[PDB]
Every structure is written in C-alpha cells, then in structure tokens.
Design a protein around this ligand. Structure first.
Ligand SMILES: Cc1ccnc(C)c1NC(=O)Cc1cccc(Cl)c1
Ligand SMILES: Cc1ccnc(C)c1NC(=O)Cc1cccc(Cl)c1
Lengths: 304, 304
C-alpha cells in the first residue's frame, strides 16, 4: 500500500553521464558506446545565444575543442557532428558502463524519470510527465543542460528526453536523443510561446484507480456517464478529450477494481464540478495527472 | 527554476541490493563489505509472524539455510547474527560495488530517499520524510522488506532506514541499520498504534521559501508574528511547535529571500487560518512538509 511519484532507479543512467566543455561553456553529456551526446548550444557563448548560427559556430570548432570528462578521466574526441539540436562527439573509448538502451520519442502525456546533473555529476532524480503542450515542469538550474529523461524496461533504458532550455515562464524544453525538440521550441534566447496546456485525462483516471486500490474511495459515487457527456465536462475544465483508446488502456485497472471506466469518469466529472471539498486523494488536494495507466499497474504490482 | 520532490541518485545503493531467502520467505538484503543486512523476519513463516520468538527461530537456522543472491551469483554465508531486528549474514566476498557509507539514525522530520526493491531487484526511487510519529508514508508491497532509505553527501551514502512492516493503517515502519525500530513498533503481526502525527513546521516554512525563490509569492502578506503567537496557531492546526533551532536552520533561506523567518511564519499562519482559496503553491493545493531547509538549499543551488 501507499502511492508515490516514483522514479526509475537511476544507476544505469548515472554511469553514462559526462561533462562536456567547449570554450567557456560546460554542460552534461550522455556517453553511450563510443558516442557522447549533448545539446549543441555547448558551442555558444552568452552573446551567441540571442540568435545563433549553429552551422557557422560549429565550423570554428575542432575535435580538440570539445573537452569530455567522465568523472576524473578525459575522453579523446575523434569526430564531431551535429544532428538537429544535438552534438554527437565520437570518442575513442566505448563506455564500459553502457546499459542496453534505445532512443525513443515519447508521446505527450507519457511519463519519464529525469536524472538532473551539473558538471557531469548526478544531483537527483524525479518523475514527471511530458505535458500535452510538449513542455516539462522540471527542476533545473543553469548547468543542468544535457540532463536526460528515460524509462526502463527490465535491463533496457529508453532515453526519451535531453534538457536544453528554460522558457521565460519557468517551464522546460528539450529534445529527443536525435536532437528534435518536443514542441515548437528553438534553441535560442528568445521569448517562445508554449501552447495552451491541458490536464492528461487518462492519467487522472489511472490515478483515481490507484486511489481506490489504496483505500481512498470517498470520491466514488452512484453515477455513470457517457464518453460524449464526460467530454463536454472535460472541455469546460481544460482536460484532454477521452477516447476509446484511453478507455482500452484503462481496462486492466477497471478489471482489477471492478469499477467500469465510465463510472470512474462520472466520479471525475463530479470532482471537476464540485472540487475536493477540503479532502485529499492519495495525499494530494488536486487531481494528479503524472501517472499513466502503465505506471499505476507497475507500482501497484511491484515490477522491477 | 521549478521545484520537485527529488530523490538522491540511487546508483550507489542499487549495487548493494541482494535477495535473501530463508526457508520459503524471500526479501531484500543490503550487501556492504562482507556483510549482508536484512530484516530478521526473513526467518519466519506466516504462522510465526503472529508472535515470533526470534531467538528460538534463529537457533533452528544454519549459515547454509540463508540463500543470498546478488543478481545471478550466489554468495557463500560464513556467519550469522541477530542485532536487534536485523540479521547480519557474514559472506566470504566483499561487495566490489560497496560505496563509501555510514549508518545513521535520522531524526523525525528529516527526509531520505527510498530505493524500493523486490527479490533483490530495484523497482523505483522516491523521496519521503520520517513522520514526527516515526512512520513513513511509503509505497511498498509484500516482498519490499529489506528495501532501504538513505541520504548521499558527495560520495558517502548514509543509510538511515530499512523497511520492515506495513501497519494495518497502510503506513510503514522500519528500523535504522542497527535493527532498532523507529517508533514504538515491533516486528509482529499485531495491530500497533502509531502516535498522533503532526505537520513538520520547519519543512513547510522551508518549502514556502522555495516557493518564493521560484516565483510563487501570492501568499506573502503585510503581517508578522512572534514565536509564541505562531505556536498558538501551530498547536490548533496540529503543527510541530517552532523553536529558535528551527528559525536558525531557516537563516540561509531567510537571507537569500530577504523575508525574515517570523514574517514567513505570519504567511503560514494566514494560510492555516484561511486555507489556499483554490490556489496552488509549487503545484500543490496543500502545505508540503517533505522538504527540509537543507533540501531546499540543495535543490535551489544544484549540489551534486
Ligand atoms: C538558466 C537555466 C535554467 C534551467 N534550465 C536551463 C537549461 C537553463 N539554461 C538555459 O536555458 C540556457 C539557454 C538559453 C537559451 C537557449 C538555450 Cl537552448 C539554453
Ligand atoms: C504486506 C506488506 C506491504 C508493504 N510492506 C510490507 C513490509 C509488507 N509486509 C509485511 O508487513 C509483512 C510483515 C508482517 C508483520 C510483521 C512484519 Cl515485520 C512484516
């Protein structure tokens, strides 16, 4: 029993973190096999960041300008290339601590763990969701650039995020491991609009099922609804429209609890229209959307 | 910017986790140097747990009855001893992945990271506080026994908790690494009272300072209070009494923000008496007490 915002064990990712320095800028890199991946803005000075011409800036750099250090040992850079917003520094040594890994581009609403790093050293780990608007509400300071997000399936780490930037609004933007930004963002010191965000409906429902499994049941009611009626309420409260694909993914939790998905939707509808009346659910006074249906089943079944 | 319930990177602790089996019971052990530490109730059957005589049960066991497996390799047990509620199994091999470590008994109100494990395999990591009543509100299922809590200072892991039991109320009880329970709990299948819990006042104040640093300032007011007046409010709302020792530990955050500790106490007083009026602080609709003043300074300064 109990329900926590649990992160994946970060060990396999800690063994990949390195420090990358170019000129006067230092950030984090990810060392997998004989390649170090890092945000391409490591090649910028503060003056460059206003409107950088990355192609021109990278041409002034040679392999010996990229200083890569793994803990205390220096890596020898034998190649460099830019792929979208990431730099790939080929090194002469394969990382002996490289776990089994994949590069994945996650969908909005999916969750992942972030290993926050500074100067190539891990400081902490936390779980978060990629917002529907492709931002993440992380905890990152200057120097955290290059910190990565990931999921783990037994022995395989799927890297899904690399941190690049903090928007003027204090929310975070980054790329997949091929350097493609999530969202409309560009790696430039300019004010950039993050779209209207919404609450991840399927995750809130998954978390209400986790609440029932763990004993918090006060919000269950004698009502039911339809997908259409529920979506009228979801639109009014800036929630993502619920689809049959979302209902299908909630099936295991519906089966485990015996509460039909549309009955849980009716509980959520009443919570949206009436608030929590000063009560809590799983220690929260708001509707939590950072747990996917997969996360709930994993945490509630003890998958290692 | 941003503020998350961040856990320490779990890598150094993952390398210590082992599976311990005795008879038909399997749980987690902590392998440090040539000793494996685990909850002594690994020697019990379900029938024994009602009122176990651990001394008598342990006498029926020999070194060869304790099966210790580190991933896929079997450890050879050359000694066994009970210290309070933990068993110490001496093995013939020192753990090559033993980090620099200490065993510490933490105070109520302090925080730590938990690496939840099943069958000696890490499933997730989360941050939590030891409640004033010496329970923890974790996320643990059957088989999580032996999972540990810890803090990390640069390269040193201070182990402070080992999970033993879930109380009938769904909250968790465990020991320090010398096997001494935190709180009045006994390792027995009996209903056990956890005392009245309170909110960790100094942590809520630390978190209000983190909110100010990160831009959430709506709760700041034009008022101040005294320790005496604040403590009358704290008593009414089941908050721990604030002392000058607590004020002194909040000094760095008071200096960083320019908000005197008693002025922050007046904001907290108004939040206690008036609620949050449907607003949030750092993404929470309640007053958070799982961040110590040290945690706030660490997260806000990027200590690795
Ligand atoms: C200051 C800070 C705080 C938290 N995370 C981060 C990542 C930062 N740093 C930046 O955003 C620097 C920067 C400026 C403009 C564009 C880009 Cl790609 C990077
Ligand atoms: C079932 C469960 C769930 C979460 N954590 C845990 C630790 C459990 N298991 C138990 O509590 C088993 C047990 C019963 C009586 C005394 C003791 Cl020391 C241990």
């Amino acid at each position: 029993s109990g329900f926590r915002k649990m992160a994946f064990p970060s060990g396999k990712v800690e063994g990949c973190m390195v420090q990358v320095t170019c000129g006067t800028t230092t950030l984090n890199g990810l060392w997998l096999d004989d390649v170090v991946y890092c945000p391409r803005h490591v090649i910028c000075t503060s003056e460059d960041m206003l409107n950088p011409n990355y192609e021109d800036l990278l041409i002034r750099k040679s392999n010996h300008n990229f200083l890569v250090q793994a803990g205390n040992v220096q890596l020898r850079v034998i190649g460099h290339s830019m792929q979208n917003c990431v730099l790939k520094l080929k090194v002469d040594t394969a990382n002996p601590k490289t776990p089994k890994y994949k590069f994945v581009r996650i969908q909005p609403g999916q969750t992942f763990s972030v290993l926050a790093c500074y100067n190539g050293s891990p400081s902490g780990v936390y779980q978060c969701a990629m917002r529907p608007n492709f931002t993440i509400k992380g905890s990152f300071l200057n120097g955290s650039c290059g910190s990565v997000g990931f999921n783990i399936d037994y022995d395989c780490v799927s890297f899904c995020y690399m941190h690049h930037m903090e928007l003027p609004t204090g929310v975070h933007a980054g790329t997949d491991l091929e350097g493609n930004f999530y969202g409309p963002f560009v790696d430039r010191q300019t004010a950039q609009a993050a779209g209207t965000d919404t609450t991840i409906t399927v995750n809130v429902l998954a978390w209400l099922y986790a609440a029932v499994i763990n004993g918090d049941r006060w919000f269950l009611n004698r009502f039911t609804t339809t997908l259409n009626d529920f979506n009228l309420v979801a639109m009014k409260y800036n929630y993502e429209p619920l689809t049959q694909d979302h209902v299908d993914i909630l099936g295991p939790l519906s089966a485990q609890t015996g509460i039909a998905v549309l009955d849980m939707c009716a509980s959520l509808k009443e919570l949206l229209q009436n608030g929590m009346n000063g009560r809590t659910i799983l220690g929260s006074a708001l509707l939590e959307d950072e747990f996917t249906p997969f996360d709930v089943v994993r945490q509630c079944s003890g998958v290692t």
